[PDB]
Amino acid sequence: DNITARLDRIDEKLSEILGMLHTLVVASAGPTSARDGIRDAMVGLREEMIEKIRTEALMTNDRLEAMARLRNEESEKMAKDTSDEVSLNPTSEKLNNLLEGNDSDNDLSLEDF
Amino acid sequence: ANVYLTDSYLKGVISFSECNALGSYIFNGPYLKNDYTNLISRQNPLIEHMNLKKLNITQSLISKYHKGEIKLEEPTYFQSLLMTYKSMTSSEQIATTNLLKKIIRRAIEISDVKVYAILNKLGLTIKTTLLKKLMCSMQHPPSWLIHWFNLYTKLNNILTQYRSNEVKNHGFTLIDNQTLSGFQFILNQYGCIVYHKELKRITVTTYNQFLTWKDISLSRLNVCLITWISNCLNTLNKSLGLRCGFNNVILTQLFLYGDCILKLFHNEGFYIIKEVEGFIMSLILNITEEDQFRKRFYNSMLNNITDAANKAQKNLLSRVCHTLLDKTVSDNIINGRWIILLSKFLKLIKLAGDNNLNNLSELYFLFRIFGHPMVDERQAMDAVKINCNETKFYLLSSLSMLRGAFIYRIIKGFVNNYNRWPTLRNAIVLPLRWLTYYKLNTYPSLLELTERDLIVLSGLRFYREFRLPKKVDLEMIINDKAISPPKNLIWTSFPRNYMPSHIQNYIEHEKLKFSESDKSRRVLEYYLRDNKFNECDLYNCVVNQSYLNNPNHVVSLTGKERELSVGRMFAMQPGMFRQVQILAEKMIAENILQFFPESLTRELQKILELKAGNYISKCSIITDLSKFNQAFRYETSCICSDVLDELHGVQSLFSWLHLTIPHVTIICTYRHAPPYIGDHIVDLNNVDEQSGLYRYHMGGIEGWCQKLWTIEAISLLDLISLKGKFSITALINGDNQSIDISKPIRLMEGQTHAQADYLLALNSLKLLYKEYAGIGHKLKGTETYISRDMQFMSKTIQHNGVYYPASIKKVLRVGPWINTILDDFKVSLESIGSLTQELEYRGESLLCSLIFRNVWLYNQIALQLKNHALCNNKLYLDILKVLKHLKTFFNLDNIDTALTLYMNLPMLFGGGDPNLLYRSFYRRTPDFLTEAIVHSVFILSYYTNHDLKDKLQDLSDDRLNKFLTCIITFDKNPNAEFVTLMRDPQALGSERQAKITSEINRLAVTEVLSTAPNKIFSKSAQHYTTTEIDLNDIMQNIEPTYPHGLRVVYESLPFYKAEKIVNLISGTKSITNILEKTSAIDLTDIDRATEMMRKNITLLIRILPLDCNRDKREILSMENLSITELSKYVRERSWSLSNIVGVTSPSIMYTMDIKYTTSTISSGIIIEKYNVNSLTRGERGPTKPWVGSSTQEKKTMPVYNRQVLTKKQRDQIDLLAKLDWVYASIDNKDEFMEELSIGTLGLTYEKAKKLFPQYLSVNYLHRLTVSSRPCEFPASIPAYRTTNYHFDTSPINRILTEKYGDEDIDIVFQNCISFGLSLMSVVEQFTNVCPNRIILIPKLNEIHLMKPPIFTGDVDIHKLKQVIQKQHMFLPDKISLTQYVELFLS
Amino acid sequence: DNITARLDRIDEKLSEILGMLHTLVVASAGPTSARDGIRDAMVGLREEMIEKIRTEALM
Amino acid sequence: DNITARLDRIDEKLSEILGMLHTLVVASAGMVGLREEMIEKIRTEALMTNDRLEAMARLRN
Amino acid sequence: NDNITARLDRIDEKLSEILGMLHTLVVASAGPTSARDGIRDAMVGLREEMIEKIRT
RNA sequence: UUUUUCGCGU
């Protein structure tokens, strides 16, 4: 049982290694903030990288979407993209109302436009 | 000197920058945008712009504009104004109507001969009553048709006048104010000013803008004409015309609303125009798809269109704010009444579709009906920059999963192909479970494969398995395209005037510091000017990684041509980096791409049948990958490319992109879009970044590494399938991909088969979005959409097994001189015929395609030949001479009848018919001479009252006899017969055939390449004629001549590559001017082309003499005549050869007699329909599609390693094996093959024999697989239609065993089956009823025995060695000893 | 058999570690290593340029 | 106690793994001997590949 | 037994490979603009040593 | 008018 007790800590430490490797995230090697050179591929723990993204250390187009992706959450934009029934913005609502229904506003004049 | 011949079709970019610069310099203010272009044009204008402005009429127009009488406007506004002409006069209207009536009547008269021949064969001024009724129907053309024809003719007259004058004298400007009423044109090569006096409006445009206006007019004319012909045909026979149908009033109104939208939204209206894809697809889904999918797609389409309209309005208001177009914005923009106009457009599109699958599928021509947007290069570059240089965050588990998926795909491919695991370094990294798979060569399936195994597999390193070619491949390197200059010479593209004085001085000082090769801008010039060239230069550069950190690396950018999406930019690189990229793509294609069958770079109908097939739920996800290139970084696109680098044993070859591109400057390299340099800066790396250029790309470039990105996407999709536990049948093809998701499910209570496929679709879409976000892609709902039973790819619609085509879209731009160089006449006729064949092949309308083709052929012959730019009237005089000759030869009483006969004669004998009758029934034929003779006989049956139902006989009217005599007897003056047969196995020779442009341009190309700095090409050209003589002399002593065996010898020998390069060079715009830095065309080229065209026109005179060349007597008797025998004798007499075998084959159309009922003599092909209905067009049957594939030859590939041999070496080995099989019975064979192997490869005959795939087929005249022999014989009808019928061959095999028994036959049965299927399709087209069965009785006299001959002769080894030594620089890589040693290691 | 089974589990987790670390090695080179001339050290030697070194040594 | 010694040395190897990975993370986000060791590795794989190539060459000869 | 000895003889090799990978990551990530020149010099020295060994 | 411009490709 001595060998088993000796390798139990081996298994625990290996599991910790794998868990923290799973939590590990890597960023792209894009240009620096000053745009005077190229930056190395920053790599680190997920929480620190999220902190850097929020503090604008690493510039990105969509910070909130980055947080949602790294935190394993369904963002509102993603839900809208993959919604069961997509909504209609007011312009599309007006276009749908115009299409569905017989002509009422006339204006069948090419010279008007 | 040299002449500048402009093009009659745009085939290019309507650049925003050129129009902006021209307008800015003309009007002394910002014309289209506040870029640097307007400032630089106003400061230092171009010489062409100054010449355009200094015109007397132009100065008056600018003075009038400055005084304020006329209001400046937009090119799109004048596009709309021209399209709604509403200014034609009565005289020109009646003239156009009369011309159109004449064209229609002549086209029907010409098509009457073909229709009569078809009807006579089938047994069912104008002789056919059907076409008599058609002519009676189409007597008065419709007003929209006259309008479009008049507009097109006016624009084409303006263009042809300008082109002719420009050819006559350089630097000509055409000032026109009478061709179009109320319109003023100042058209020029470098500008086009349009002024409307009545409306007091004026713009400046480009020559490309005028070209695309003319193309809009031509396209709308073609749509109206095709729809009118189809409707008129359907009026008297509903199954005679095209499947789709429009009244064309809706179509004209649709065009008016579309270009009204374009005018109202300016150049940004093409954003709205492009989104019509969504509306058409939604209308199709409303019919096919279920309730939930159709509603979701409809809502998404509405959102996309409205978002595009809002973005277009915002961009337009931002752009034209501080310009000269500030007050030109329509009042409808601000108040938002444009929504009513867009709703009217959409409703009218839906009405035109008329809730019909055929109409909605065919409507796709609307995209090309409107013009092309003026692409703003700087704006597109800014968009791609902001999309590219953005930091992306990847979970390390996700990257490991993707790499492991790629590794698993590679391992699966290696196992399935070579039956073994790849040699991998990290044998200890794998656990015991994977070690078992490594020792015993198997792989687990996806069901037992897991995320854990993908993580494990991501840490595998392999040894070299594939070999880089040591010698550069000139066929895949050389091209006629352009390359970007080096980084230090990037200013050489921009004009001097635009560049600052210090930049001009710097570039003048730096030119002499660069070689002549890299100082050029074209691929051909770059490689021809390389004095210090080396075959082992690309390999050395790749091995040494010379492209890394190269100071002379730059990436140009230019807007994509003829693209409705302005955000399409194509990039160029210097010669070395272009070589590296092309090589990486080529090796990925040859070696890695065949591990990923899901990537179709490989018939679209076929591919789509692949997709035509307690509860298994199926789905469909279609994703657009237009922006998928820019989402890749080194951390994503190179973790998988490192696998390819390791497999090839190379470093940084497949990952060159995200190792070199980030360190260089991405610059818009266009003539009229120069960046602002400033002062004391003479290099891109220090030039500041603005809208004109940017640095640190950090992303992919479209096109380059496209195959790598597609295989990475396939690996990602396989991973997605693993993580979602559903099967994926993804079929990615270039820029669009389709996904077939299948997952067995247990149905819940109250849930049907529907609304569960939707749930699977939603779950799979969520998974796809999450995984693409993890890999680094942010695809939105615009690109991707949801479907249940859609098979959509390459703009093709197919569901329920029925394929709905879009033939009008691709036959849309058919005109006088299309797809031609130097306005070639014969090439134009072939292009017209091929484009009009699309209607028959896809829309299933033989007669509509025939009428359209004859309309445009008659237009080209009798309307545009007298207006040829290069030769003013010589072609028309030659045509008149040929027509008079035909009238004298036959008993024709009218020059119109002579023209009809010429239009209906095959172009092989100097005729005018591009599409012979066999093309109407079977696409491919073994030989063309027999088919041409049969076509000529069938056509001559129109004037001579023969009967094709029975056997050919002899009558009093011996015009057919005279023709068949003039083609069988002639003088024999052959030369270079064997090399000519090697080049073209079906060549006739002795001036009995028309001359191809390459045949005359070969001498000029060799003369040019002789005086070239490149030693390789110089020596190849200098030793060309001697090589030709030696090649002719190699195999002149073989008694039985086999043209296909000669072609195999030609392919095996190294002269093939040199002559292929010569032929590719021969297709350039101007030979003898490549090494002169001029884009004009030499007078020698013009004269040579004119002489070729005149000789080609005046060919019927030589082929059909007025004395029959037989002393005006001894006319061949028609009784007991074999067309196959006659054609074979003509070929042998032309080549002065005792016996030519293996090239002639009986014409199936002539041989197969047609009877629709069975009898005691029913010994024919049994073809019958299986669908229980009268009309089977547009319906699917129960049988498998008739691919028409030829019989596979029998081979025994030896067991040896093939990955260590390159593709060129494998091809050479296969060619040598074919040679050994074909010419085994040769007295000189032993040392002939020994010397051939020693020359081509590094091995001897004995060593090479171990790699030869010995052939088990006794006959090589029936099973040989030359590139000059067809590999399949598909029918004219598409794949889906062939599924409605069943075919049999047992009576034919019985009769062919009774006669010519137990021996191979020259006839091909695949062509017979295709002919029968298309025959019954044509029968139902012409009779509105499908026969129950048709029987194809063969005429046994054309049937000939075809057996392997025993060659008697010796191959001239001296001449073979001379050819090998002279063309020693085009040989493939020699199989070295170090490569041969591992050929047999297990 | 328990010792062998848990040794096999440890081996599988070690393979996990090797895979993740190797993909980190590959993704960590980037264009930054190319300009510094250290990507060859990061990814190691390969057959083609080793053969080039061999033929240079013989020559 | 050879198995016990092997397990113990594996334990120090794992502890070194933790320390080295932690210092790598803090260096990337937040020496001569290591470079020498990695160069010696790169050399030993370069020598194994060269051994394979020379075996191929001697089989050729 | 033999199986245990083989398993440990593979495990220690795996640990050595892991240590090598951590070594190369630490070397590449650290030494900003200073260690790169040393790595380049070590690479050219390794190439010279390989050339000398092949010559010998 | 630094060869009018014209990528990779299917």
Numbering used by the authors:
A (entry chain E): 129 to 241
B (entry chain A): 10 to 133, 184 to 661, 666 to 676, 690 to 1462
C (entry chain B): 129 to 187
D (entry chain D): 129 to 158, 170 to 200
E (entry chain C): 128 to 183
The authors write:
The respiratory syncytial virus (RSV) polymerase is a multifunctional RNA-dependent RNA polymerase composed of the large (L) protein and the phosphoprotein (P). It transcribes the RNA genome into ten viral mRNAs and replicates full-length viral genomic and antigenomic RNAs1. The RSV L protein consists of five domains: the RdRp domain, the capping domain (Cap), the connector domain (CD), the methyltransferase domain (MT) and the carboxy-terminal domain (CTD).
In the Le10-bound RSV polymerase structure, the 3′ end of an incoming Le10 RNA template enters the template entrance channel, briefly touches the edge of the Cap domain, and runs towards the ‘GDN’ motif of the catalytic pocket from the bottom of the bowl. Additionally, the ‘priming loop’ (residues 1250–1280) of the Cap domain was distant from the active site, indicating that the structure represents a pre-initiation state for de novo RNA synthesis at position 3 of the template. Most of the interaction between Le10 RNA promoter and RSV L occurs at the ‘fingers’ (blue) and ‘peripheral’ (grey) regions, which form a composite tunnel for the RNA template to enter. The RNA–protein interactions can be divided into three parts: (I) positions 1–4 of Le10 and the catalytic pocket; (II) positions 5–7 of Le10 and the template entrance channel; (III) positions 8–10 of Le10 and the gate of the template entrance channel (Fig. 2a(I–III)). No interaction was found between T2G and RSV L. Positions 3 and 4 of Le10 (T3C and T4G) are opposite to the catalytic residue D811, which occupies the −1 and +1 catalytic sites for RNA synthesis. The backbone of T3C interacts with residues K540, R637 and Q640 from the fingers region to stabilize the RNA template during initiation. The base of T4G interacts with residues K619, F629 and E778, all of which are conserved across the polymerases of NNS RNA viruses. In the Le10-bound structure, there are twists at positions 5 and 8, followed by a 90° rotation for the bases of positions 8–10.
